[PDB]
Design a protein around this ligand. Structure first.
Ligand SMILES: CC(C)[C@H]1NC(=O)c2c[se]c(n2)[C@@H](C(C)C)NC(=O)c2c[se]c(n2)[C@@H](C(C)C)NC(=O)c2c[se]c1n2
Length: 1188
């Protein structure tokens, strides 16, 4: 993974930028050391109560002389301590504000220049750059990687400096207040980073082991869902459900262990930090009895050091974000500092005023940049006279268009030069070159705007009248005037789709507006019907007037009208001259003449479900029974801590017998380690309870889910929201993550309710007014912590949604770069981009201010809470209300308990994502279809007749109830006789075949099989005797024997049936010939096969079940040569003794059908045999008159 040097990355910072960064950092530093200072002052705070405990404990000394020496003293000390606390907080809001605000600000101002110059840089690149690069990922880079470099030069490093300042502040205050104790805790430190480092490796080892564990089930997942039509059709749903399941109980069982080890990692962590508490206090409290360190000093150094330690942990992601931001900056700066071979942005060449129009190509050697290994043009020589129209032909290779591509100077020749007049094409400016060179591509292209605007892109300073005149010059003024909104009619990608002819003509106009003296036409008529081709070529011929025109077309019809015809054989131009010369010399030209004669949309729709998801995991009560109790223990573990902590310093603040200062000390210290042991117990237990639970739940769930998917109708997979990828992804992620809402959430809610629950009881007994103040302050800060992540993500989305206005412009400007570059106007697109950017950049100032005041609002009262609680608490302890130890206890319980619930909320997966990803699962499983293939109901007679009779039956697709497909068409087919379907196109060609297979339910009307209605029969048994062959047959990545045997399920197929079904489909010859026999895998993972052979296998497939009904629907549209003959020959011998329904567009193998049905609109307007309908001179006579 690459990265830019740090200095190079802030290259686009300036005066004010460097200023903002420096001031910001300076604020970050002082914000950082604020917390350790708060710790020192905390120690200096406890050291004062320590003196008022011991005196008032032992016996009695002075009743009237204590209120003056103690009560009046502590008020006088807390009146200054309050100033210290509140002071530091009041400063903190300011310094935090400057920090976040300024960093965010400067960052934004840099990014703004970065994205723009990135866009400009992409545009500056020549097409040779676009050839070797993927425009798809480049387009995404402009949004994702610039956003990625935005994060990591802003708030993140502000919080990095703050974090490091908290580190050094903590260690400095530590060493300044305490020498020994700091070295103690730091001596404990290297066993934590050694532990967090090995346990991270263990969890990451099984994590990458899961990816390629379940992938063996995802393979048979995507394979099924992709081939689903043939699956339901061949009813292999059972064998496929099983085949899927057999790869589940080997991939998540691997995950059980990982869940376990993860929990053990967390447990070990708590064990070791609790151990550090035990040891640290065991040393410090024994250090205060020898009256070396005070009690408050122990706290000062312990807190400051621990805080400075965790500061790095909270500095780690902030420096990681800076890191990978440099990695992104590498790609972007690369493009910006890159000046291409052709610029193409500033004039450096001449601008001829003649301007003539004489073309010349002298000794052109050129090969494409993508493949330097294959040379294209070798000594290309070709001159073109003024106004003379020259055509290119020969069917050599890309060379043709390459010449055209060389002409607008897209590429530059390897050897030789392309000269216009007496000057080379490189000795002239490139902008001006392409302004005087028009071009019409093989595929037209229009930008999402108005026709008028699409024209403007050819020339900006054109009046409406000029636009009109130009439109007329392209024979486009007719249909455009017919458009509803005239010239303001929308076009392009989204809105008002046009025909290829119209779209192309508009482009002819666009080019014509430039008034070029040279006109290039690369397959302009190509990919167009014979009717539009007339008008298009008509405009073109009138556009070749007064202009020097080179033209390449696949159709030699419009070629003979040129002045010079040039032929291409290999890399050189061999035959050149008039039409008659090339006809007379019988060249390549003559030979050709004779040879040619959804992510958001998904998550939005489901409502629900409040805690019903748990009912899914409910199948295993015990794991949860142990889990909940364990969770309550691990939860009550935290309140215990804050109690025992308050008891450590309590015995050194409330005095008492000095002889009992040690006896107590060592008790509590050791007890902490005890509190550690049980903490490693709970997590070891939890990882066996919930950990297993959600995993079993996962496996099981997927099974159910997958089964559910196979139950659905075919109408559900046609639904635009359910694709094989989205379904397999739904299966791979949301099915696993459901566990989040089951065990883990119970664990969290119980650890929380135990912690804050029991903890609030304790703090309520040890304090009335103080606890009531704390249960007031803490929730208020907690609400702020929510609002913090509300206005953060909230205005994070608002910024992106106003950034799509740019994203569109960029995207359109990139995917059609090769187009715009020929119309120049790249700078016009840049200007559009900036005009789109000017609005969210203006909202970056207010943005920074907002992040500022929000962050500072949260951060400010985080110290004011200390100030309030300790002031009020001091007010308590000083007066008759007791005591200090109780103040510290209440504080610790409620506050650090409240932080504890934060950590517990952060552990488990996100409940929101869990629930929404669960709802899809519960809806998918509980989804009852119209057509059920699992039902064990149905007739199943003894009659092997098979008569198909559609009566009435009007149908329309559920996906799109617009222009119904079947308007109640009717027909009938008897046994043996085969039907034929003829029409303009599909619908309802395929629809009928699909209805017999029962893929849909017609709104009104019925379809009868034999004497019974279809809906009365068994769904599966109906498809048990229905054979089906689509246009593009698919096989399974298993094997051939299984593929053939896949036709008939719920039975042992064996060698006999397969060889018998192979020999009659005429595929047996191809099997022994290619090593080895039947064991081969198809396809893509094994030996590839041509469509012919694969389809033959697909026939031998449908033939195994001995179907009395074959459904043939546009079987072979892509089969050529003598491969289509043997296929249909193999078909003909299996069409006897079976009812068949054939659909073809060939119209040459329908002449021998028994019945031929001409379906038009939504009904049958012609029926009978071939010659019968032929003598009818209806629509069948006009449809068969195109066979010449
Ligand atoms: C250190 C920071 C990560 C962070 N710790 C936690 O957010 C946390 C989440 Se569970 C937990 N801590 C447990 C647990 C670690 C045993 N410890 C306590 O409940 C506890 C009772 Se007294 C006390 N801490 C003192 C300390 C210094 C004795 N801590 C602080 O003044 C302090 C200010 Se921020 C912060 N700590």
């Amino acid at each position: 993974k690459p990265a830019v040097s740090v200095l190079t990355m802030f290259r686009y910072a300036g005066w004010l930028d460097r200023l903002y960064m420096l001031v910001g950092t300076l604020a970050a530093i002082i914000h950082g050391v604020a917390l350790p200072l708060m710790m020192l002052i905390f120690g200096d705070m406890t050291d004062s109560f320590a003196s008022v405990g011991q005196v008032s404990k032992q016996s009695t000394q002075m009743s009237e002389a204590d209120k003056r020496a103690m009560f009046a003293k502590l008020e006088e000390e807390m009146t200054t301590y309050a100033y210290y606390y509140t002071g530091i907080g009041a400063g903190v809001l300011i310094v935090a504000y400057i920090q976040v605000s300024f960093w965010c600000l400067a960052a934004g101002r840099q990014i703004h220049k970065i994205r723009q110059k990135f866009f400009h840089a992409i545009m500056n690149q020549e097409i040779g750059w676009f050839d070797v690069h993927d425009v798809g990922e480049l387009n995404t880079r402009l949004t994702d990687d610039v956003s990625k470099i935005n994060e990591g030069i802003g708030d993140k490093i502000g919080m990095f400096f703050q974090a490091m300042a908290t580190f050094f502040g903590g260690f400095i205050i530590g060493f300044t207040r305490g020498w020994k104790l700091t070295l103690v805790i730091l001596a404990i430190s290297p066993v934590l980073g050694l532990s967090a480092g090995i346990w991270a490796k263990i969890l990451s080892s099984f994590t990458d082991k899961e990816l390629h564990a379940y992938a063996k089930a995802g393979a048979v997942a995507e394979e099924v869902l992709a081939a689903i039509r043939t699956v339901i059709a061949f009813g292999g749903q059972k064998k496929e459900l099983e085949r899927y399941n057999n790869n589940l109980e080997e991939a998540k069982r691997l995950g059980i262990k990982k869940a376990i080890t993860a929990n053990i990692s967390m447990g070990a962590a708590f064990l070791l930090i609790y151990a550090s508490y035990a040891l640290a206090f065991w040393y410090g409290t024994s250090l205060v009895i020898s009256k070396e360190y005070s009690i408050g000093q122990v706290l000062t150094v312990f807190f400051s050091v621990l805080i400075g330690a965790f500061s790095v942990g909270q500095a780690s992601p902030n420096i990681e974000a800076f890191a990978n931001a440099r990695g992104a900056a590498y790609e972007v700066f690369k493009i910006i500092d890159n000046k291409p071979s052709i610029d193409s942005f500033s004039k450096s060449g001449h601008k001829p005023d003649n301007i003539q129009g004489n073309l010349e190509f002298k000794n052109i050697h050129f090969s494409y940049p993508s493949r330097k290994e294959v040379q294209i043009l070798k000594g290309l020589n070709l001159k073109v006279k003024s106004g003379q129209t020259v055509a290119l032909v020969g069917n050599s290779g890309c060379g043709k268009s390459t010449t055209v591509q060389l002409m607008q100077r897209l590429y530059d020749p390897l050897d030789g030069m392309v000269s216009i007049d007496g000057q080379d094409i490189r000795t002239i400016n490139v902008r001006y070159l392409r302004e005087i060179i028009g071009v019409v591509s093989q595929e037209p292209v229009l930008f999402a705007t108005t026709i008028a605007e699409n024209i403007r892109y050819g020339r900006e300073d054109v009046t409406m009248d000029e636009i009109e005149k130009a439109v007329k010059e392209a024979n486009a003024y007719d249909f455009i005037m017919k458009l509803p909104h005239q010239f303001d009619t929308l076009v392009g990608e989204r809105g008002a789709q046009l025909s290829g002819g119209q779209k192309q003509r508009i482009a002819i106009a666009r080019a014509l507006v430039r008034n070029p003296k040279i006109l290039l036409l690369d397959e302009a008529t190509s990919a167009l019907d014979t009717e539009s081709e007339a008008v298009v070529q008509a405009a073109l011929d009138k556009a070749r007037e007064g202009r020097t025109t080179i033209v390449i077309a696949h159709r030699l019809s419009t070629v003979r009208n040129a002045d010079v015809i040039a032929g291409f054989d290999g890399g050189v131009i061999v035959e050149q001259g008039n039409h008659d010369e090339l006809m007379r010399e019988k060249g390549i030209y003559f030979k050709l003449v004779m040879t040619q004669t959804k992510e958001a949309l998904d998550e939005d729709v489901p409502p629900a479900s409040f805690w019903r998801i748990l009912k899914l995991n409910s199948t295993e009560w015990p794991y949860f029974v142990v889990g909940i109790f364990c969770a309550i223990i691990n939860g009550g573990l935290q309140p215990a801590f804050s109690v025992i902590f308050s008891k450590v310093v309590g015995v050194f603040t409330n005095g008492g017998p000095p002889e009992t200062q040690r006896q107590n000390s060592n008790l509590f210290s050791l007890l902490f380690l005890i509190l550690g042991i049980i903490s490693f117990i709970t997590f070891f237990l939890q990882g066996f309870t919930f950990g297993k639970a959600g995993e079993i739940l996962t496996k099981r769930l997927r099974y159910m889910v997958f089964k559910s998917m196979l139950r659905q109708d075919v109408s559900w997979f046609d639904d635009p929201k359910n694709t094989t990828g989205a379904l397999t992804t739904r299966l791979a992620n949301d099915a696993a993550q459901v566990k989040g809402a089951t065990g883990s959430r119970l664990a969290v809610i119980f650890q929380n309710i135990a912690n804050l629950g029991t903890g609030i009881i304790i703090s309520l007994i040890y304090g009335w007014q103080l606890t009531l103040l704390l249960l007031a302050i803490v929730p208020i800060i907690a609400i702020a912590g929510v609002v913090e992540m509300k206005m953060l993500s909230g205005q994070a989305l608002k910024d992106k949604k106003e950034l799509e206005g740019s994203g569109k412009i960029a995207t359109e400007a990139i995917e059609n770069f090769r187009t715009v570059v020929s119309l120049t106007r790249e700078q016009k697109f840049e200007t559009m981009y900036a005009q789109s950017l000017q609005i969210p950049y203006r909202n970056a100032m207010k943005k920074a201010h907002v992040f500022g005041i929000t962050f500072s609002f949260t951060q400010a009262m985080m110290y004011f809470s200390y100030a309030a609680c300790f002031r009020f608490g001091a007010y308590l302890v000083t007066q008759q209300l007791m005591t200090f130890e109780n103040v510290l206890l209440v504080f610790s319980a409620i506050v650090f308990g409240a932080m504890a619930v934060g950590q517990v909320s952060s552990f488990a997966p996100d409940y929101a994502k869990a629930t929404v990803s669960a709802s899809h699962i519960i809806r998918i499983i509980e989804k009852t279809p119209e057509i059920d293939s699992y039902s064990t109901q149905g007739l199943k007679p003894n009659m092997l007749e098979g008569n198909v009779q559609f009566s009435g039956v009007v149908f329309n697709y559920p996906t799109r109830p617009s222009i119904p497909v079947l308007q109640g068409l009717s027909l009938e087919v008897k046994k043996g006789q085969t039907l034929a379907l003829v029409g303009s196109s599909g619908c309802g060609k395929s629809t009928v075949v699909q209805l017999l297979e029962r893929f849909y339910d017609p709104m009104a009307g019925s379809v009868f099989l034999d004497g019974k209605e279809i809906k009365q029969l068994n769904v599966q048994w109906l498809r048990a005797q229905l054979g089906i062959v689509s246009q593009e047959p698919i096989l399974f990545d298993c094997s051939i024997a299984e593929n053939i045997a896949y036709g008939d399920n719920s039975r042992v197929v064996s060698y006999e049936e397969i060889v018998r079904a192979a020999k009659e489909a005429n595929i047996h010859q191809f099997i022994d010939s290619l090593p080895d026999k039947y064991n081969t895998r198809v396809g893509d993972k094994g030996t590839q096969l041509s469509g012919g052979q694969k389809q033959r296998i697909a026939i031998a497939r449908a033939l195994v079940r001995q179907p009395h009904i074959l459904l043939l629907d546009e079987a072979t549209s892509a089969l050529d040569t003598e491969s289509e003959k043997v296929v249909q020959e193999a078909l003909d011998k299996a069409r006897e003794g079976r009812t068949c329904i054939v659909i073809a567009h060939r119209l040459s193998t329908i002449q021998n059908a028994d019945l031929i049905v001409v379906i038009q609109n939504g009904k049958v307007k012609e029926h009978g045999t071939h010659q019968q309908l032929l003598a009818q001179k209806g629509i069948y006579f006009s449809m068969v008159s195109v066979q010449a």
